[PDB]
Design a protein around this nucleic acid. Structure first.
Ligand SMILES: [Mg+2]
Ligand SMILES: [Mg+2]
Ligand SMILES: [Mg+2]
Ligand SMILES: [Mg+2]
Ligand SMILES: [Mg+2]
Ligand SMILES: [Mg+2]
Ligand SMILES: [Mg+2]
Ligand SMILES: [Mg+2]
Ligand SMILES: [Mg+2]
Ligand SMILES: [Mg+2]
Ligand SMILES: [Mg+2]
Ligand SMILES: [Mg+2]
Ligand SMILES: [Mg+2]
Ligand SMILES: [Mg+2]
Ligand SMILES: [Mg+2]
Ligand SMILES: [Mg+2]
Ligand SMILES: [Mg+2]
Ligand SMILES: [Mg+2]
Ligand SMILES: [Mg+2]
Ligand SMILES: [Mg+2]
Ligand SMILES: [Mg+2]
Ligand SMILES: [Mg+2]
Ligand SMILES: [Mg+2]
Ligand SMILES: [Mg+2]
Ligand SMILES: [Mg+2]
Ligand SMILES: [Mg+2]
Ligand SMILES: [Mg+2]
Ligand SMILES: [Mg+2]
Ligand SMILES: [Mg+2]
Ligand SMILES: [Mg+2]
Ligand SMILES: [Mg+2]
Ligand SMILES: [Mg+2]
Ligand SMILES: [Mg+2]
Ligand SMILES: [Mg+2]
Ligand SMILES: [Mg+2]
Ligand SMILES: [Mg+2]
Ligand SMILES: [Zn+2]
Lengths: 96, 60, 147, 123, 74, 114
RNA sequence: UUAGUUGGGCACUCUAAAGUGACUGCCGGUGCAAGCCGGAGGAAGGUGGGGAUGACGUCAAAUCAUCAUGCCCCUUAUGACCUGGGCUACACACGUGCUACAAUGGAUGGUACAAAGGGUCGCGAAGCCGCGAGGUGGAGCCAAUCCCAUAAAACCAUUCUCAGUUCGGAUUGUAGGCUGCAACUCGCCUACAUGAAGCCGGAAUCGCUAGUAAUCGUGGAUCAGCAUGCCACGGUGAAUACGU
RNA sequence: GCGAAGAACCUUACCAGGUCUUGACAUCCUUUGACCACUCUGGAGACAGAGCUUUCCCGGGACAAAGUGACAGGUGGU
C-alpha cells in the first residue's frame, strides 16, 4: 500500500527505470499497480535574441517534466525491504 | 560607476523595498528570471552550451 | 494571385428553406462573428415579408433577383498612361456578389427602426421594381451606358 | 460513436427508440435554444432514413455552443453507420464521417495575432 | 496614509516643532493640527522655499506648496 | 417643474436626473422615498406625489445651492497656495495626468500650430 | 447522495510511451517524359495546416550601456557614501495602441458552453462585517485531488423609441480601500456628484488568402505594490482573386 | 508600445546640497583574534560619542578587525 512518484525530464530514462522496479515489484508481489501516465508540465521562456534593439526577434526554450506513479495493492514484507535497495539514473525522482 | 553597485545589490538595505534583483553572473539589473537568477543574455548563452538541465529549444 | 484562377466556396444550405441564396445574404449581413444576430434577423425579415406580401417568402426574396443583378460593370482600363472607364459584361461572380451587396450596402436607406423589417422592406421594395437597390442597379448601368 | 470538432468532443450511444435526442442529462431543446441550428444534427439521420427510429444519448465536454453542433453531428454519423454497413455508402459522401480539421492557430512572436502584424509606416 | 487608520509625520519635524525658523529637510510630512503658526522650510531639490503653515492649509502634504519645475512661459 | 424644467415625456427616475445633484443612484432612491413607482410618467406625476418629492429633495443638495460649494472648494485651493491650485488657473490637469501630449479636456481646443 | 458523492469497474473519454496511416498510390484525358486537368477510396490529396532549422555573402549596418578586449584620459576625482530632486516639464509636430460617436444598441433581472498556465514560506476556501474597493477567519494543497477561478461575447423576458440622448465617457469636488519607513511632485482601485469632444473622419495611408482578418475574454514573465504594452490560450467567424 | 520581462524611494548612469581617501568593493603582508549584532544623544541620513561586549576550532586551519603602500576604481572616449 505504498505510492512512488516518478518525475524525470526525459521520457526515455524514467520509463526505462520504471520498467525495472515494476519488474522487481512482480517478483516481490503479484499485486502490482503498474506504471501509469499523468499529464506532463510544460513551461516556456521567451528570451530576447539581440543584445540591444530589434524587439521582434526572440528565442523560446521549454522544459518538460514527464510524470509517472507506481503504487502497491496488497504488499508484503518484501516491499519495504526490496524497494530502497535500488539506485536509479540521475534525473529520476523517487518519493515513496 | 558599475562594479561599485553590485555591493549595493548584495548588502541588506534599511528597508525591504530598496532591495531588488540582478543577474548572478554579470550584474545586469533588468530582466532577471527568478527561477534561474540569470539575466536574459546569460540565460541563453548557457542554454546553448547546456549547463541548464531540462531546458531545450522548443519547436513546439 | 499571379498564377491562374481560383474557385470559391460560400456553400452551406441553411436550415429553413434550404438554399444558398439564403445562406448568402445571411453571411453578407453579419459583423465581427455575429452569425446569431443575423440569422434570426434574416428569418424575421422573411416573417414580415411572408405576411405583408402574401406570396412565398422564398419566391418573394428571389423576386428581387432580376431587379438587382447588374449587367454591365464599367471597368477601369489602363489606356494612354492613365485609367479610364471601359464598360464590360460582369460575370456570375460580380452578379450575385454585387447583387446581394447592393441590398445590405443600402440598408441605411429603408429608414426603419430595426433591421428585422428594414431588410424585409427593401427586398419587397426591389420586389416591386422600386426602391433604391434596383435604382442603384439602374444607376450603375447608367454610367456604363455613357461609355 | 465518438465525434470531435474544434475543442469540443461528443460521445454518442445510439439505441432504437422513440427519437428523443437527449443531450448531457438534459433535454436538447433546453440545452440548445436556437432549434434552427439543431436541425443539422438530424442530417446523420435524414440522409439515411432513420430519423425517429432511435433515441440519441449524448455526452458533451468543452468547446462552444456551436462547437458541439459539429461534433454531435459527426459523433452520431459514426454510429448510425456502424449499425448497418449499408449506411456508409451515403454517410461517407454527404460529408459526415469526415472530421473537420480546422483548429485555432498558434500566436507567433513579432506578430499581434497568429497571422496579423504591426502597422507599417515608411517615412 | 490614505487609510483612515493612520496619520504620520516624518520622525522629527513634529519633535522640533513641538519645542519650537524651522528647516525640516525633506518633504512629505503633512501639517497636522499642531503646527499652525510656525513657519517651516521644506526643501525643493535646491534652496529652501519658505511656507507659513496657516489654519487653512492643514492636512495637506507639506511638499505641495513648493513647486519643483520652473516654467516661466514657453 | 420642480426647481427647473424637468422633462415632461420621460419617466420619473430618468427625468428627475435633470438637476445638478440628482443623478441615477440618488434619483432611484429619492423617487423611491416618495413612493412613486419608478416607471410613472413625469408628465402624469401625481399631485399627491409632487408635493411629497419636495420633502426629500429639500434634504439633499440641489443645483443653485450646492454648486456654490463646488466653486468655493475649488477656489480655496488657489488662494491657499497649494500646487493643485496652480494647475487650476493655468489650465492643466490637476492630477498626475501628463501634459506632454494628449491632454486637451482642460487646455481648451487644439491650439493653432505654433 | 444535495451533489461522481460511496462500494465497484477501466467499457467509453482522456492522459502518454511504442506503432499504422498519404506516397501522384489507383483510374480517365494529355504529355515522349517531367508533369498538368478530373474521379474513387480514405479522418486527411497533391510539400494536409503550423513551428524549429537561415548557404556564399551585403550594409565600415546596431551595440565599448550585458560580459571581454587594443589604445588614450581621470586616479584627494571623470572614483565613493546619503538625503531631496529630475528621469512623468509643455505654447507645438510625428509613430504605435485604448474608448466611442448608438436600435446588429443601452439599462434591469435570469441564465449556458472553454483552452492553456501558476502555487511553500506560496495559493489562500466557507462563514462574518460591509452598496463599496476590502478587512477578519483559516478549510484543502508540495497538487489530473485543493486553491488562483463565477470568462465574457451568445441567449431568454420588460423598459427605452432615433435626442450630444436612458450613447459616450474625459475633467473636476468630496468621501474611501490596498502595499509600502513613505502614494505632495508621481501608484492602482471604489461610491456619490460633475458631466466635456464625438453624430463614422480631407488629400493620403495600413493589415490580412481561412479558423485567416474582426471581435469578446483568460493566464504567465518582471513583480512589497503598479500594463490599454509584451509573451501565450481559447469562444463567435466572414468577403473577393478576371488578371500582371 | 524601441534596450526597459515593472522610473514614488531603490533601480539611476543626471542635478543641488552634505561627506571619504589603500578607498564601498579584490590579491600581497604584519599586530590582534572568530568579527558582529544591541541601547542612549545628535543630526536629513551619510556618520560621530559612550557601554556589555563577538565565550574560534584542530604549532597549524577557515573568517574577521586595525596598520603604509602594489594597487584598486571608472555605465569616462574611440
Ligand atoms: Mg531568426
Ligand atoms: Mg521593486
Ligand atoms: Mg467507411
Ligand atoms: Mg506574416
Ligand atoms: Mg514649451
Ligand atoms: Mg501617471
Ligand atoms: Mg493634435
Ligand atoms: Mg484498456
Ligand atoms: Mg483527387
Ligand atoms: Mg505541410
Ligand atoms: Mg512550415
Ligand atoms: Mg522564423
Ligand atoms: Mg564588406
Ligand atoms: Mg562594421
Ligand atoms: Mg545608420
Ligand atoms: Mg557610452
Ligand atoms: Mg564575454
Ligand atoms: Mg564572461
Ligand atoms: Mg521615458
Ligand atoms: Mg511614464
Ligand atoms: Mg497615430
Ligand atoms: Mg451597431
Ligand atoms: Mg458600452
Ligand atoms: Mg487547464
Ligand atoms: Mg466583461
Ligand atoms: Mg457585447
Ligand atoms: Mg450610459
Ligand atoms: Mg466636467
Ligand atoms: Mg472639470
Ligand atoms: Mg448636465
Ligand atoms: Mg452621461
Ligand atoms: Mg470640463
Ligand atoms: Mg501568403
Ligand atoms: Mg515561469
Ligand atoms: Mg512601457
Ligand atoms: Mg525608450
Ligand atoms: Zn548576466
Amino acid at each position: 500500500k505504498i505510492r512512488i512518484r516518478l518525475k524525470a525530464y526525459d521520457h526515455r530514462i524514467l520509463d526505462q527505470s520504471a520498467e525495472k522496479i515494476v519488474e522487481t515489484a512482480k517478483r516481490s508481489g503479484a499485486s502490482v499497480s503498474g506504471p501509469i501516465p499523468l499529464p506532463t508540465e510544460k513551461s516556456i521562456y521567451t528570451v530576447l535574441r539581440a543584445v540591444h534593439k530589434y524587439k521582434d526577434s526572440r528565442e523560446q526554450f521549454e522544459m518538460r517534466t514527464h510524470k509517472r506513479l507506481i503504487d502497491i495493492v496488497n504488499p508484503t514484507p518484501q516491499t519495504v525491504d526490496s524497494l530502497m535497495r535500488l539506485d536509479l539514473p540521475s534525473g529520476v525522482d523517487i518519493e515513496i | 560607476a558599475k562594479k561599485s553597485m553590485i555591493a549595493k545589490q548584495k548588502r541588506t538595505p534599511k528597508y525591504a523595498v530598496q532591495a531588488y534583483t540582478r543577474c548572478e553572473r554579470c550584474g545586469r539589473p533588468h530582466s532577471v528570471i527568478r527561477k534561474f537568477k540569470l539575466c536574459r543574455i546569460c540565460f541563453r548563452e548557457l542554454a546553448y552550451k547546456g549547463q541548464i538541465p531540462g531546458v531545450k529549444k522548443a519547436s513546439w | 494571385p499571379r498564377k491562374g484562377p481560383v474557385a470559391k466556396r460560400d456553400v452551406l444550405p441553411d436550415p429553413i428553406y434550404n438554399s444558398k441564396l439564403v445562406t448568402r445574404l445571411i453571411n453578407k449581413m453579419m459583423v465581427d462573428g455575429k452569425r446569431g444576430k443575423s440569422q434570426a434577423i434574416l428569418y424575421s425579415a422573411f416573417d414580415i415579408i411572408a405576411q405583408e406580401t402574401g406570396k412565398d417568402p422564398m419566391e418573394v426574396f428571389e423576386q428581387a433577383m432580376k431587379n438587382i443583378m447588374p449587367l454591365l460593370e464599367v471597368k477601369a482600363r489602363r489606356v494612354g498612361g492613365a485609367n479610364y472607364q471601359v464598360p464590360i459584361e460582369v460575370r456570375a461572380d460580380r452578379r450575385s456578389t454585387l447583387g446581394l451587396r447592393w441590398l445590405v450596402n443600402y440598408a441605411r436607406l429603408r429608414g426603419e427602426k430595426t433591421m428585422e423589417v428594414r431588410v424585409a422592406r427593401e427586398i419587397m421594395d426591389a420586389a416591386n421594381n422600386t426602391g433604391a437597390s434596383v435604382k442603384k442597379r439602374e444607376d450603375t448601368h447608367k454610367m456604363a451606358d455613357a461609355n | 460513436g465518438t465525434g470531435r470538432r474544434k475543442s469540443s468532443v461528443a460521445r454518442v450511444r445510439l439505441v432504437p427508440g422513440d427519437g428523443k435526442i437527449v443531450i448531457n442529462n438534459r433535454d436538447w431543446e433546453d440545452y440548445i435554444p436556437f432549434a434552427a441550428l439543431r436541425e443539422v444534427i438530424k442530417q446523420p439521420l435524414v440522409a439515411t432514413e432513420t430519423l425517429g427510429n432511435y433515441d440519441v444519448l449524448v455526452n458533451v465536454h468543452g468547446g462552444g455552443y456551436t462547437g458541439q453542433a459539429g461534433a454531435i453531428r459527426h459523433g452520431v454519423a459514426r454510429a448510425l453507420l456502424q449499425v448497418a454497413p449499408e449506411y456508409r455508402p451515403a454517410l461517407k459522401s454527404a460529408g459526415l464521417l469526415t472530421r473537420d480539421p480546422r483548429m485555432k492557430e498558434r500566436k507567433k512572436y513579432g506578430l499581434k495575432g497568429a497571422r496579423r502584424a504591426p502597422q507599417f509606416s515608411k517615412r | 496614509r490614505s487609510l483612515k487608520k493612520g496619520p504620520f509625520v516624518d520622525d522629527h519635524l513634529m519633535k522640533k516643532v513641538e519645542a519650537a525658523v524651522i528647516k525640516t529637510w525633506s518633504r512629505r510630512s503633512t501639517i497636522f493640527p499642531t503646527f499652525v503658526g510656525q513657519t517651516i522650510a521644506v526643501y525643493d531639490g535646491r534652496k529652501h522655499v519658505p511656507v507659513y503653515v496657516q489654519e487653512d492649509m492643514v492636512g495637506h502634504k507639506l511638499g505641495e506648496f513648493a513647486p519643483t519645475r520652473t516654467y516661466r512661459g514657453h | 417643474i420642480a426647481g427647473v424644467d424637468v422633462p415632461r415625456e420621460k419617466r420619473i427616475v430618468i427625468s428627475l436626473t435633470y438637476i445638478y445633484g440628482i443623478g441615477k443612484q440618488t434619483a432611484k432612491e429619492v423617487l423611491a422615498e416618495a413612493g412613486v413607482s419608478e416607471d410613472t410618467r413625469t408628465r402624469d406625476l401625481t399631485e399627491e406625489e409632487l408635493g411629497k418629492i419636495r420633502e426629500i429633495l429639500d434634504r439633499i443638495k440641489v443645483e443653485g445651492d450646492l454648486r456654490r460649494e463646488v466653486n468655493l472648494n475649488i477656489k480655496r485651493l488657489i488662494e491657499i497656495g497649494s500646487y493643485r491650485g496652480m494647475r487650476h488657473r493655468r489650465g492643466l490637469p490637476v492630477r498626475g495626468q501628463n501634459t506632454k501630449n494628449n491632454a486637451r479636456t482642460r487646455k481648451g481646443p487644439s491650439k493653432t500650430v505654433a
